[PDB]
Amino acid sequence: KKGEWLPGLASPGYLTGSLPGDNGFDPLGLAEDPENLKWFVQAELVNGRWAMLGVAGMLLPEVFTSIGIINVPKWYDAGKEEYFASSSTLFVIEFILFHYVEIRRWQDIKNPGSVNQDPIFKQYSLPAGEVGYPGGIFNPLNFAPTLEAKEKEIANGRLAMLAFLGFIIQHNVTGKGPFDNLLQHISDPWHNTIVQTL
Amino acid sequence: DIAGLTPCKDSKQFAKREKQSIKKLESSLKLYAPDSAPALAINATIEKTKRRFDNYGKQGLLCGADGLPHLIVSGDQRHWGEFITPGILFLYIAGWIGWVGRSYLIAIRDDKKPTQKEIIIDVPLATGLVFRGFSWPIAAYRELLNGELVAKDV
Amino acid sequence: TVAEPDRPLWFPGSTPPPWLDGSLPGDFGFDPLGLGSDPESLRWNVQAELVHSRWAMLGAAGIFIPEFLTKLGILNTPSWYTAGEQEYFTDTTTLFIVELVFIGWAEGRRWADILNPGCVNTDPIFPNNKLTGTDVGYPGGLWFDPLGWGSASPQKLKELRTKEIKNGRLAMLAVMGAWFQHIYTGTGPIDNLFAHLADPGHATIFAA
Amino acid sequence: MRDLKTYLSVAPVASTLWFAALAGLLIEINRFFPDALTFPFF
Numbered sequence: 001k002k003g004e005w006l007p008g009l010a011s012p013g014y015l016t017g018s019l020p021g022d023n024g025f026d027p028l029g030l031a032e033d034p035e036n037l038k039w040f041v042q043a044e045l046v047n048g049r050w051a052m053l054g055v056a057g058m059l060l061p062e063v064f065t066s067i068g069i070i071n072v073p074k075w076y077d078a079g080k081e082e083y084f085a086s087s088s089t090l091f092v093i094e095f096i097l098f099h100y101v102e103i104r105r106w107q108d109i110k111n112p113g114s115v116n117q118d119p120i121f122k123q124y125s126l127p128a129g130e131v132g133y134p135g136g137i138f139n140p141l142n143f144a145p146t147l148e149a150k151e152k153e154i155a156n157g158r159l160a161m162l163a164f165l166g167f168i169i170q171h172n173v174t175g176k177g178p179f180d181n182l183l184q185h186i187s188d189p190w191h192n193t194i195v196q197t198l
Numbered sequence: 199d200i201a202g203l204t205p206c207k208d209s210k211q212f213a214k215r216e217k218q219s220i221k222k223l224e225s226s227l228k229l230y231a232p233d234s235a236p237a238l239a240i241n242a243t244i245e246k247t248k249r250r251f252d253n254y255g256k257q258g259l260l261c262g263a264d265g266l267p268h269l270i271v272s273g274d275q276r277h278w279g280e281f282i283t284p285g286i287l288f289l290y291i292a293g294w295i296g297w298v299g300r301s302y303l304i305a306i307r308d309d310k311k312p313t314q315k316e317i318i319i320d321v322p323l324a325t326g327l328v329f330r331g332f333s334w335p336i337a338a339y340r341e342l343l344n345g346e347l348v349a350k351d352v
Numbered sequence: 353t354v355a356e357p358d359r360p361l362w363f364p365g366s367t368p369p370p371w372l373d374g375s376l377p378g379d380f381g382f383d384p385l386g387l388g389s390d391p392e393s394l395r396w397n398v399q400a401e402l403v404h405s406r407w408a409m410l411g412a413a414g415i416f417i418p419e420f421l422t423k424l425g426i427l428n429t430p431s432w433y434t435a436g437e438q439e440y441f442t443d444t445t446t447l448f449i450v451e452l453v454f455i456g457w458a459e460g461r462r463w464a465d466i467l468n469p470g471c472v473n474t475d476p477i478f479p480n481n482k483l484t485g486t487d488v489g490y491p492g493g494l495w496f497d498p499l500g501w502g503s504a505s506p507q508k509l510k511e512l513r514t515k516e517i518k519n520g521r522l523a524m525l526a527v528m529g530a531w532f533q534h535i536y537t538g539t540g541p542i543d544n545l546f547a548h549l550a551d552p553g554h555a556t557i558f559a560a
Numbered sequence: 561m562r563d564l565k566t567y568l569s570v571a572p573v574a575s576t577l578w579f580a581a582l583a584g585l586l587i588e589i590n591r592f593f594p595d596a597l598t599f600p601f602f
């Protein structure tokens with residue numbers, strides 16, 4: 001039992017259950033090629049991690065301000081609030097920093113193990129891990145990278161990506177934050193749904 | 199505005215043409231009975247014309263001295279709805295069609311008599327293949343990078 | 353399977369088609385167009401007929417018993433034909449969508465079983481339930497067969513299934529007749545029955 | 561039935577059915593959103 005996305009359907013051959021979260025879901029056959037699968041697994045990892053962080057950032061502040069602890073704006077309108085630096089300055093700083101770190105990650109992906117070493121202090125190299133899972137300084141608490149935990153990470157990331165899609169579509173169609181939508185639906189579920197929204 | 203044109207909403211010849219079109223349509227209506235099928239059809243057409251002109255004014259199209267909408271395709275972000283996002287949509291659909299057809303041709307190329315599956319379409323296989331065009335933008339990209347989109351040795 | 357060369361036929365004196373050898377419950381050799389010749393298509397059509405029969409029996413009951421019940425002053429179900437617009441506790445669209453997801457789940461389970469027999473009999477939440485039925489189209493189990501009336505010898509189950517399919521065909525024709533009557537006339541099926549019984553010689557199709 | 565399916569998938573018949581379906585789809589899309597000269601949604 002590798003997990004079946006359709007009980008009555010067999011899983012694709014190129015999927016063998018080795019990868020965490022492998023439930024045999026790939027109707028479009030996007031991973032017929034081992035290299036394509038190897039690239040897409042990393043794509044999924046990074047997309048899921050970013051999605052989890054983003055959905056947390058959009059959700060937790062909203063509920064916290066709704067219950068009355070902090071007074072943050074909504075995620076969609078948070079762009080206008082003036083910060084200590086100009087928006088363009090922040091964007092360019094972020095661009096430089098990410099242009100460095102993401103290229104480091106890319107070099108790791110292309111040929112594993114070539115960028116485990118600190119480029120300034122010749123000591124302090126990362127432990128020889130696996131692509132997409134660089135331990136060492138990135139894992140201070142040193143939680144075991146057990147396979148079951150990897151599956152939990154993958155599942156939570158997929159849920160977060162679905163949630164972000166919902167966040168943006170709900171904001172586009174309704175015009176407010178997700179938590180307000182949930183609260184309104186809870187107030188009267190039988191007259192507050194997509195049908196009445198549309 | 200761009201190219202010396204003016205917005206259709208505040209243009210005058212556009213409004214004159216709108217009025218003239220409605221007047222022409224109404225001219226026929228007065229001949230029939232007030233509430234007959236031809237009269238209802240003509241009224242529906244008049245309402246359609248009014249809605250069309252109002253929508254054209256609403257979207258912010260540009261009107262020339264002729265009073266007709268003109269499409270800007272230079273790339274101005276104020277007019278991406280005129281050619282660029284429809285262009286992207288067309289490219290997506292056309293690549294869908296071409297990729298699906300190419301996938302079918304490659305799939306049936308291994309039989310002893312491939313021509314038989316070309317004049318008599320193997321629908322079972324085609325129904326499975328047609329859905330690859332949802333993600334053809336990725337399949338073709340990785341097909342090119344992997345270097346097997348283009349037939350080498352040729 | 354028990355092939356009955358000498359079963360009663362839909363058209364006495366004519367040989368039934370080769371692909372209809374009496375294996376299926378309620379086989380009378382009726383296939384003029386020969387639609388079910390292909391074995392896989394034959395199985396698919398058998399499943400289609402079974403599901404159509406069950407749906408139509410439910411519909412015939414829920415269209416006729418309630419109206420035979422409101423014709424007599426017992427309760428007040430409205431006309432079935434126009435019963436779709438009388439507003440309930442919520443709008444029709446939300447009910448349609450919530451009903452759609454549930455029935456889609458059920459029909460997906462059924463589809464998975466049809467195209468892969470005996471591959472979904474276990475409950476995905478508590479894998480100690482297991483539908484007992486071992487035949488496609490006959491799930492059985494504690495849910496769809498709590499009484500276990502039809503688990504005995506195959507011969508008994510054969511004629512019980514024949515009873516099922518015959519009642520289903522009758523129900524299908526009944527529901528279609530109710531629809532065609534309400535569109536042709538402007539009254540209810542029980543009204544039509546009562547009027548025709550009052551005047552069996554003149555209250556018929558040829559009254560318009 | 562099997563031969564009916566085979567002939568029903570031959571080039572001319574399949575093409576006519578495909579193009580009838582495409583024509584109907586485009587006709588309905590135009591009917592719901594007629595006189596559309598731009599993409600205003602985004």
Ligand code: CLA
Pocket residue numbers: 522525526528529530532533536537544545547548555556557558
């Ligand atoms: C399936 C059983 C069945 C039964 C018992 C009835 C019974 C009745 N129908 Mg009806 N009908 C049916 C099916 C049925 N119909 C079907 C499937 C259709 C769609 C074509 C119609 C369409 C229909 C219309 C448009 C009308 C009736 C009318 C009537 C009533 C007067 C008969 C008449 O003049 O119309 C003649 C009906 C037909 C020629 C079609 C019937 C043919 C089917 C195949 C049934 C054959 C009977 C079957 C072999 C034996 C039944 C078993 C048992 C009940 C005896 C009557 C009480 C009339 C009415 O409302 O009364 C004023 C009327 O206007 N029916």
Ligand SMILES: CC(/C=C/C=C(C)/C=C/[C@@]12O[C@]1(C)C[C@@H](O)CC2(C)C)=C\C=C\C=C(C)\C=C\C=C(C)\C=C\[C@@]12O[C@]1(C)C[C@@H](O)CC2(C)C
Pocket residue numbers: 025026027028029030047048050051052053054055056057058074075076078161162164165333
């Ligand atoms: C990256 C991501 C989200 C990141 C969000 C971020 C950073 C948000 C940041 C901010 O919010 C903060 C924190 C604060 C706010 O004030 C400001 C912003 C700036 C807004 C989501 C990805 C989200 C990605 C999504 C939703 C992807 C969905 C993919 C699907 C459904 C694919 C399914 C299949 O592909 C399979 C698996 C198999 C194939 O064969 C078949 C198909 C069916 C194609």
Ligand SMILES: CC(/C=C/C=C(C)/C=C/[C@@]12O[C@]1(C)C[C@@H](O)CC2(C)C)=C\C=C\C=C(C)\C=C\C=C(C)\C=C\[C@@]12O[C@]1(C)C[C@@H](O)CC2(C)C
Pocket residue numbers: 382383384385386387404405407408410411412414415431432433434435436524525527528
């Ligand atoms: C008659 C029918 C089909 C007839 C098919 C025939 C004769 C085919 C015959 C042949 O093919 C064979 C066998 C052999 C071939 O070689 C030759 C031919 C000759 C081609 C299907 C009906 C099948 C009928 C079905 C499935 C109907 C179910 C309807 C329901 C449940 C309705 C429910 C209600 O909605 C209402 C209408 C009103 C609401 O207010 C309340 C509720 C109760 C909700």
Ligand SMILES: CC1=C(/C=C/C(C)=C/C=CC(/C)=C/C=C/C=C(C)\C=C\C=C(C)\C=C\C2=C(C)CCCC2(C)C)C(C)(C)CCC1
Pocket residue numbers: 271272273282292293294295296297300338
């Ligand atoms: C932006 C724009 C513009 C312009 C542009 C230009 C001028 C450019 C370009 C361009 C180019 C310069 C291009 C090119 C190309 C080349 C090549 C070389 C290619 C290719 C491809 C291919 C080959 C493909 C294939 C396929 C597909 C993918 C689809 C389907 C299938 C097949 C297989 C067919 C303008 C201003 C007008 C307007 C606005 C927009």
